[PDB]
Coordinates of C-alpha atoms and ligand atoms in Angstrom, one line a residue:
X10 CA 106.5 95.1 68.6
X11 CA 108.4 98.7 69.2
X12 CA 105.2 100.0 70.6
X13 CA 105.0 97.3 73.3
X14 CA 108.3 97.4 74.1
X15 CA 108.2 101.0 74.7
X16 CA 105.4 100.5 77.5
X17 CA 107.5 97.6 79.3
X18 CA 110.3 100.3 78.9
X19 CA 108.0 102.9 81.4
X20 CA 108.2 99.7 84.2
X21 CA 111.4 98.3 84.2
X22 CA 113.8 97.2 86.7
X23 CA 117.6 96.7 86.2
X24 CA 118.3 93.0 87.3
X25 CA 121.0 94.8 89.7
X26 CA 117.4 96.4 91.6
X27 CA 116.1 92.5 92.0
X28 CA 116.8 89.8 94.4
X29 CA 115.1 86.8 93.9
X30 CA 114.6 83.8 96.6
X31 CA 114.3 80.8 94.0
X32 CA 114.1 78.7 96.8
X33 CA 111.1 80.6 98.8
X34 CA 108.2 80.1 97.0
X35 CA 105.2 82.0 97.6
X36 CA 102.8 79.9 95.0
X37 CA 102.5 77.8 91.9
X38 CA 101.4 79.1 88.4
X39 CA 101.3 77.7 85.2
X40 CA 103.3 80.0 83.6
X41 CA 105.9 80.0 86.7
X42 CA 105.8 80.1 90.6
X43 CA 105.8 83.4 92.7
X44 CA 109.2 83.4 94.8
X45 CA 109.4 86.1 97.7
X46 CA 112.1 88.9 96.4
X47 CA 113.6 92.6 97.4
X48 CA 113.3 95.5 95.0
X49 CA 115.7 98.1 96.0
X50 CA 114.2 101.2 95.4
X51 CA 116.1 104.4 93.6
X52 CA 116.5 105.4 97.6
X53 CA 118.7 102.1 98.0
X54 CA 116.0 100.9 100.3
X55 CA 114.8 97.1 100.3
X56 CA 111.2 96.7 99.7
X57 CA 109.6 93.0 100.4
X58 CA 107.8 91.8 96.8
X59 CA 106.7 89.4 94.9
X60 CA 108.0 88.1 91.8
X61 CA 106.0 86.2 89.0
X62 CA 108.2 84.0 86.7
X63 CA 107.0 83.9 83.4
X64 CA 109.5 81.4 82.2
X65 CA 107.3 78.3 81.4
X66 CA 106.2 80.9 78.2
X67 CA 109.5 79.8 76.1
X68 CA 107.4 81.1 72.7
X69 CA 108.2 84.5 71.8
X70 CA 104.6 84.8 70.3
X71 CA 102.7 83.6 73.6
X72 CA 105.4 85.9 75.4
X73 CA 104.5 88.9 73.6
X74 CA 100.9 88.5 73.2
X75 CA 101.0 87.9 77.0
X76 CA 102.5 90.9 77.6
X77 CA 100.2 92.7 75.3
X78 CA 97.4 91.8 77.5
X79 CA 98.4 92.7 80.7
X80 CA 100.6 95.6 80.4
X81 CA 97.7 98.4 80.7
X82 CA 97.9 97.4 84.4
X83 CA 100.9 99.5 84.8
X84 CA 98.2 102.7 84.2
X85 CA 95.7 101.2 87.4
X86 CA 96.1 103.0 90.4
X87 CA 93.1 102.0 93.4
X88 CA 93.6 101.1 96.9
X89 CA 91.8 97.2 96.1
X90 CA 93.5 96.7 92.9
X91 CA 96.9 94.8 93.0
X92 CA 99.4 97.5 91.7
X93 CA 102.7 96.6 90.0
X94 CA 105.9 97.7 90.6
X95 CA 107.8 96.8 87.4
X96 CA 109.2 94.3 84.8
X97 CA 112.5 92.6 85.0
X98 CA 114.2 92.0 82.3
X99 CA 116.9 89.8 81.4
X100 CA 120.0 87.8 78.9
X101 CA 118.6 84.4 80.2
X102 CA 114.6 84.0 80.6
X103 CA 111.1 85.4 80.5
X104 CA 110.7 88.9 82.0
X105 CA 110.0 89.1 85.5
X106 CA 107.0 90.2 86.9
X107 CA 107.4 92.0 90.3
X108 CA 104.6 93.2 92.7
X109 CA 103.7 94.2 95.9
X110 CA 104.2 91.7 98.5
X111 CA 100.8 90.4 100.1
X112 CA 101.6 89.5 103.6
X113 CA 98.4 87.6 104.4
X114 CA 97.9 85.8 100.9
X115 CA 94.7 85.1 99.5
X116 CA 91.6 85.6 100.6
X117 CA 89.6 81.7 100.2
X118 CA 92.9 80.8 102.2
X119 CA 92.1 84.2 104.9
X120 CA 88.4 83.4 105.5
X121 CA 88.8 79.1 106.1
X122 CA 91.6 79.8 108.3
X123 CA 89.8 78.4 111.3
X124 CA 91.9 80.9 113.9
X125 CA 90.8 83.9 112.0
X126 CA 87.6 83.1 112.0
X127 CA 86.5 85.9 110.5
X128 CA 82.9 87.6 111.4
X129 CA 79.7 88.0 109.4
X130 CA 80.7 91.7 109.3
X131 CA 84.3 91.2 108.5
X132 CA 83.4 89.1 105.6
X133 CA 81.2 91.8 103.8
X134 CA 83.4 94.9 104.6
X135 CA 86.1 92.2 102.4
X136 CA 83.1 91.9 99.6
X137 CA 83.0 95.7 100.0
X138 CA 86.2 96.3 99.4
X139 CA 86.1 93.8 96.3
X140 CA 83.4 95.5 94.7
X141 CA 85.3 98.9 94.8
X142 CA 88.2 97.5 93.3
X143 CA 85.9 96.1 90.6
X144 CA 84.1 98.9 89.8
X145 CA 87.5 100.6 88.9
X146 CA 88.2 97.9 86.9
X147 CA 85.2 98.4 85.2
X148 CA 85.1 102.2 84.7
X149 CA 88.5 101.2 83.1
X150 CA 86.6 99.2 80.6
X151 CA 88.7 96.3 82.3
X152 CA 87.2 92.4 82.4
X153 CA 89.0 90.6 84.7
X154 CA 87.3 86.8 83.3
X155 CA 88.7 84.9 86.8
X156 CA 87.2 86.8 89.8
X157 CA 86.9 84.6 92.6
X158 CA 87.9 84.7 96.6
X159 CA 91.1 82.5 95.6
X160 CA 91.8 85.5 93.6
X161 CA 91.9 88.4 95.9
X162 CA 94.9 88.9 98.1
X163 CA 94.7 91.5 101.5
X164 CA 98.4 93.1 102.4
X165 CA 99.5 94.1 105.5
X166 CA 96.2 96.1 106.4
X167 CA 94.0 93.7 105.7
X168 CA 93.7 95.7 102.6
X169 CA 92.0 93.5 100.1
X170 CA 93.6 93.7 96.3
X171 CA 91.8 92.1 93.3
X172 CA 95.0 90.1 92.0
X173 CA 95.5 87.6 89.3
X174 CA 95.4 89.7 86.3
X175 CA 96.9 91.5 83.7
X176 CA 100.4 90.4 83.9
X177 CA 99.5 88.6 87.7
X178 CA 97.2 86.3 85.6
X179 CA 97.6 82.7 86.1
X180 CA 96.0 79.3 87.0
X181 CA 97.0 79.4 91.5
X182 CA 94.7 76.6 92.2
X183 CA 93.9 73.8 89.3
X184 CA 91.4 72.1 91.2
X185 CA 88.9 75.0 90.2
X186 CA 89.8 74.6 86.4
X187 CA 87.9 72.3 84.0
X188 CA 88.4 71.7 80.2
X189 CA 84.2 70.4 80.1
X190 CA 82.8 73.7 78.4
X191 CA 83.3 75.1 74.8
X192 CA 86.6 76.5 74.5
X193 CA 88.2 73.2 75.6
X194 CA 90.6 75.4 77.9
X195 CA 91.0 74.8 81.5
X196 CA 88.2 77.5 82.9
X197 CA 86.7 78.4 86.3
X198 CA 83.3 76.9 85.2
X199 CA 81.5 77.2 88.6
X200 CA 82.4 80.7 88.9
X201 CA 81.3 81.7 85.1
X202 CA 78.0 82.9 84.3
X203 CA 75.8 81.0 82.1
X204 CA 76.5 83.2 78.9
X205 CA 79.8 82.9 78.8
X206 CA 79.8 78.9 79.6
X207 CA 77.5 79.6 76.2
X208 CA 78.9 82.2 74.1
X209 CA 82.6 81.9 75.7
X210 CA 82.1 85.8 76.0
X211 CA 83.3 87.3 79.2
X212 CA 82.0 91.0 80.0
X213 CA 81.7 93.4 83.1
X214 CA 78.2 91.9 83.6
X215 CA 79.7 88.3 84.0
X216 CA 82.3 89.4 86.5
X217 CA 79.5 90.9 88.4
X218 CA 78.2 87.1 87.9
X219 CA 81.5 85.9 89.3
X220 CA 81.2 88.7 92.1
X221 CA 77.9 87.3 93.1
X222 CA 79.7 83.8 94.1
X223 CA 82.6 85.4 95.0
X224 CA 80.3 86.7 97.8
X225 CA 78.9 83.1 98.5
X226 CA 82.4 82.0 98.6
X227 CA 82.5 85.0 101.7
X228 CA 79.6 83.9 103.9
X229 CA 80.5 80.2 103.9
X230 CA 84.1 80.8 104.9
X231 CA 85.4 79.5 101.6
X232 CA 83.2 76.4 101.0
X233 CA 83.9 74.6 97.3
X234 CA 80.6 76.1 95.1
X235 CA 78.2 73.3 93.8
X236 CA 80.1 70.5 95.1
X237 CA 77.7 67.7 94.4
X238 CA 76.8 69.7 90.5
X239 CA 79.5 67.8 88.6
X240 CA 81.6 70.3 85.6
X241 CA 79.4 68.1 83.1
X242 CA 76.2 69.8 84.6
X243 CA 76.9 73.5 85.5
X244 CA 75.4 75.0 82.2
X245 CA 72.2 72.8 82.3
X246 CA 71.8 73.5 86.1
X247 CA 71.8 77.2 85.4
X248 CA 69.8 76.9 82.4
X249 CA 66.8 75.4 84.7
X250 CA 67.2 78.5 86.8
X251 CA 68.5 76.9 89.7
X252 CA 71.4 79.1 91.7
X253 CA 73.7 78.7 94.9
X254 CA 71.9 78.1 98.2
X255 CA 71.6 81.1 100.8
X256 CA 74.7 80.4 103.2
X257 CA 73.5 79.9 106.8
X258 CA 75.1 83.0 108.0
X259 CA 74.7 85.1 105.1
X260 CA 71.8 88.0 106.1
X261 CA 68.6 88.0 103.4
X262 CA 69.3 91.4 102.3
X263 CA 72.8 90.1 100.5
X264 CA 71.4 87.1 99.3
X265 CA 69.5 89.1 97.1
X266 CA 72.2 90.9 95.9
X267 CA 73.9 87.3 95.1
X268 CA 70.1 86.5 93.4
X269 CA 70.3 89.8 91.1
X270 CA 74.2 89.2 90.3
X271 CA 73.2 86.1 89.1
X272 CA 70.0 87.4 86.7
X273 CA 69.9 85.1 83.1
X274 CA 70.0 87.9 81.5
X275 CA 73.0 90.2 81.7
X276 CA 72.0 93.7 80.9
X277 CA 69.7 92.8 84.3
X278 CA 72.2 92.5 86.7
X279 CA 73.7 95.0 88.8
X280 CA 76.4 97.7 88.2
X281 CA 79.5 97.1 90.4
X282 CA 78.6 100.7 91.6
X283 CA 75.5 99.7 92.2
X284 CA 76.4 97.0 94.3
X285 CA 79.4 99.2 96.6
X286 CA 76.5 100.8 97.5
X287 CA 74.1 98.2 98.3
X288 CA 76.5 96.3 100.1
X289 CA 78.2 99.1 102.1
X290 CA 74.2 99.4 103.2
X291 CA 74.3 96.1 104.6
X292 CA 77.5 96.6 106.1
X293 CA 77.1 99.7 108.0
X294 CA 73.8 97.9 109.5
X295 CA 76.4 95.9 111.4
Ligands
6XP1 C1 95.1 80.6 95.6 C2 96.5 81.1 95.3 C3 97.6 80.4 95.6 C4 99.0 81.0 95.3 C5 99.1 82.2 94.7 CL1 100.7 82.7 94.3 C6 97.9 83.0 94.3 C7 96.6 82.4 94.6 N1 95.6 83.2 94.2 C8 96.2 84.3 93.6 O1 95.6 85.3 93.1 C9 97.7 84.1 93.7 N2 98.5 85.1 93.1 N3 98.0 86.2 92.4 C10 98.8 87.2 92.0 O2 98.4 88.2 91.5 C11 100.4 87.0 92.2 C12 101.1 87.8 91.2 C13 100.8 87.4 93.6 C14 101.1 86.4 94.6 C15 101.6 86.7 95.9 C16 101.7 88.1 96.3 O3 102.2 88.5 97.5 C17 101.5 89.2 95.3 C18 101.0 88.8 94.0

């Protein structure tokens, strides 16, 4: 399709720009790992990235459908909302997908990393900043469908970024996916909200579902959700009302925002402007 070549044309990079470490690997996808690279800018100056190989995707029809999806993310702009820097592409092999380097990684991996140890206030300023970069997604009429801690990176300033989507989109840790629901696809069942585990429609409200353990995930440091509620019994759980317990260190005040992201009924939940400012509320009490 001309049309979608023309907006990969905006973000390229000339393979002479790229220098790929194939032998540094950053993480594992299904679609390809992420190797450490250097972008050289137009200045000649080497910039630290990321690069996303896309080359398990041999079919040119999952290739370009692919693409189709994620290639608005080239028009985001927000401090909490991985960014990308371009698309290499190439003679031999799936295009390229190059982005900022995250020095710290992601954030389940931040927050369980028993030196950091991470405070009670340090772990909702990084829900803050999650529910900013949300609610940009969101005014962009943007559902990300996978929002989870595993899925949020913080660079160099402890700068969190909503990653893994758009062209960044990927399965990073399989032990999270289960093909036990409707669509018979590997899905992030324990972080889906009940409408979409039975409709297999995903909308802003059920991210804001997905924020609401996502923010679980935060005050327990990165424990596993339901971890004795097997992926045969998430919907029915649900369905009889029953939600994630109130982490020990988690304040009452956000464990009601957890309780409202998780309302049966979607249009009942909260806005994820309504939520920055709830939680930056809480926050500032600390
Ligand atoms: C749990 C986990 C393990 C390994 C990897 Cl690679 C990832 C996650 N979780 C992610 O979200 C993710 N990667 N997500 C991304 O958007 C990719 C494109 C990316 C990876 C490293 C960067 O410095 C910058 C971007």
């Amino acid at each position: 399709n001309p049309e979608l070549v023309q907006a990969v044309q905006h973000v390229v990079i000339g393979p002479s720009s790229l220098i790929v470490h194939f032998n540094e690997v950053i993480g594992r996808g299904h679609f390809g790992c992420v190797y450490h690279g250097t972008l050289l800018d137009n200045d000649g100056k080497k910039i630290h990235c990321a690069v996303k190989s896309l080359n398990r995707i041999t079919d040119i029809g999952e290739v370009s459908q692919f693409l189709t999806e994620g290639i608005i993310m080239k028009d985001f702009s927000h401090p909490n909302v991985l960014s990308l820097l371009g698309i290499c592409l190439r003679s031999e092999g799936s295009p390229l997908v190059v982005l900022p380097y995250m020095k710290h990684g992601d954030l389940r991996n931040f927050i369980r990393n028993e030196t950091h140890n991470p405070t009670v206030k340090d772990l909702i300023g990084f829900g803050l900043q999650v529910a900013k970069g949300m609610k940009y997604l969101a005014s962009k009429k943007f559902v990300h469908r996978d929002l989870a801690a595993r899925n949020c990176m913080l660079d160099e300033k402890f700068t969190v970024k909503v990653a893994d989507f758009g062209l960044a989109r990927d399965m990073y840790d399989k032990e999270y996916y289960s093909v036990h629901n409707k669509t018979g696809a590997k899905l992030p069942v324990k972080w889906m909200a009940l409408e979409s585990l039975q409709t297999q429609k995903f909308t802003t409200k059920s991210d804001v579902w997905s924020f609401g353990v996502l923010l679980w995930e935060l005050m327990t440091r990165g424990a596993p959700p339901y971890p004795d509620v097997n992926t045969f019994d998430i919907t029915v759980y649900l369905l009889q009302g029953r939600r994630l317990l109130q982490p020990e260190y988690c304040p009452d005040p956000l464990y009601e925002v957890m309780l409202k992201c998780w309302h049966p009924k979607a249009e009942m939940r909260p806005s994820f402007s309504e939520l920055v400012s709830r939680i930056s509320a809480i926050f500032s009490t600390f």
